[PDB]
């Protein structure tokens, strides 16, 4: 059992697992082609975990160190960087553990942007 | 009804929004009934992008990068209960070339 859970205040909460989905833009990362058209283009990489919700997470990886200019060439005077976001996930507790689920956070790459060293 | 979920949040500062060629503002969204209670929604500053010279260029566009996230919402006043909820958020912006 995650011993860290002892240090969480409060230890447990009551939650309705009937998920209320307010997002009408389904598959928001994979439904657009921004990953291809961006000056800081990226590939999405799939991760699958049966003991996690969401079970499938796609994460961005920048294709280039620099950014792509109007000529279609990489310019190293700027940087392709991944935009990171901390998100909530649920995880399944091991069988010998008290309850079935636990709540925690992970850091994921959502997409990439082009940044200049100094503004 | 509900289910006992263990908290394991406690476990074992970027300036991209300014330095980006598709810069964005961060709008503070506060909700006492939501966890996270505060979310910063990205808002693209320009229709175009900033070029190498530091000027607005309309040959490209600033567009939001969005994703669906898991969120806790406080249920009606039985109280001390929550409900799982999915929302769409903008985390930043990127610069893309027009579909042509």
């Amino acid at each position: 059992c995650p011993n860290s859970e002892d240090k969480n205040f409060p230890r447990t909460v009551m939650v309705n697992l009937n998920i209320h989905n307010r997002n009408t833009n389904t598959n928001p990362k994979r439904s657009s082609d921004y990953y291809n058209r961006s000056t800081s283009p990226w590939n999405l990489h799939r991760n699958e975990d049966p003991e996690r919700y969401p079970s499938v997470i796609w994460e961005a990886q920048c294709r280039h160190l620099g950014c792509i200019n109007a000529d279609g060439n990489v310019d190293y005077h700027m940087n392709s960087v991944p935009i990171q976001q901390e998100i909530l996930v649920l995880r399944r507790e091991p069988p010998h553990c008290p309850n079935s689920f636990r709540l925690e956070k992970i850091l994921v790459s959502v997409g990439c942007t082009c940044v200049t060293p100094i503004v | 009804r509900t289910v006992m979920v263990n908290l394991n949040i406690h476990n074992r500062s970027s300036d991209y929004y300014n330095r980006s060629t598709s810069p964005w503002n961060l709008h503070r969204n506060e909700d006492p009934e939501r966890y996270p209670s505060v979310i910063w929604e990205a808002q693209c500053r320009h229709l175009g992008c900033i070029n190498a010279d530091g000027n607005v260029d309309y040959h490209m566009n600033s567009v939001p990068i969005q994703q669906e996230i898991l969120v806790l919402r406080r249920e009606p006043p039985c109280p001390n209960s929550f409900r799982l909820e999915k929302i769409l958020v903008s985390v930043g912006c990127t610069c893309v070339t027009p579909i042509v």
Partner: antibody, heavy 115, light 107 residues
Framework: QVQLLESGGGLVQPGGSLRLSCAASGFTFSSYAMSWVRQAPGKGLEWVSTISLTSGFTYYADSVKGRFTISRDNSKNTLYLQMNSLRAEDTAVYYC????????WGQGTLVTVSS | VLTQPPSVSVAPGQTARISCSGDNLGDKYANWYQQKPGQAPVLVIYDDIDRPSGIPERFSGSNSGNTATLTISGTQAEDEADYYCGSYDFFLGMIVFGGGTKLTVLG
């Protein structure tokens, strides 16, 4: 210019009742959560209650639960604190404040509980 | 429980630091308030690091580990006041304050 002005303070007997009001101006009142914070003379800040912009959601400190009722009238830009069954320990300066960050405060109003 | 030093002293023009500690404070957002005698509290730092418009740039904040810290650079006599840390606890549905810190400017 954002402002919060409170009314209704004064002398009240133990067990008695008293309503505080907080008038908000210079912003869209219904777009913000509001709170009451109190401070006994020479003491620190103590959170009393919070009301969401969303109807139905109120929050209270344990020492106050069941005795104080927070409410708001958005049409009048006014926050209320209904204080019943008042005790000597409730004697304090009461502040209203906006948002969970408490980013703007009222001028405060003294409530004195005494027989 | 949010814990603050009862008081800190600082030489004029130097850097003052006021700490605020509690459980999972690094998991939450800390806010800082300045209260001068007879006055209402004033927000000087919110969401750990953010500074409201009108507040001098010499005021900064951080939240590392179970400790939030209010920092005042080039401290002036006018900065003498009580300083309170505050934080919203979502799961408790409460706002918690530290006990407060009295800042004294020396000399």
């Amino acid at each position: 210019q954002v402002q919060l002005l409170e009314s209704g303070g004064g002398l009240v007997q133990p067990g008695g009742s008293l309503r505080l009001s907080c008038a908000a101006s210079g912003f869209t009142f219904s777009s913000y959560a509001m709170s009451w914070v109190r401070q006994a003379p020479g003491k620190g800040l103590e959170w009393v209650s919070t009301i969401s912009l969303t109807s139905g959601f109120t929050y209270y400190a344990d020492s106050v639960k069941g005795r104080f009722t927070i409410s708001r009238d958005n049409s009048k830009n006014t926050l209320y604190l209904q204080m019943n069954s008042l005790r000597a320990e409730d004697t304090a300066v009461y502040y209203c404040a906006r948002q969970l960050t408490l980013d703007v405060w009222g001028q405060g109003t003294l409530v004195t509980v005494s027989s | 429980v949010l814990t603050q030093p009862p008081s800190v002293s600082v030489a004029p023009g130097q850097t003052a630091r006021i700490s605020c500690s509690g459980d999972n404070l690094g998991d939450k957002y800390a806010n800082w308030y300045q209260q001068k005698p007879g006055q209402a509290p004033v927000l000087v730092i919110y969401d750990d690091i953010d500074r409201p418009s009108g507040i001098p740039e010499r005021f900064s904040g951080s939240n590392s580990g179970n400790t939030a810290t209010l920092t005042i650079s080039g401290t002036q006599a006018e900065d003498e006041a009580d300083y309170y840390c505050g934080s919203y606890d979502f799961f408790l549905g409460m706002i918690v304050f530290g006990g407060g810190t009295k800042l004294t400017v020396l000399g």
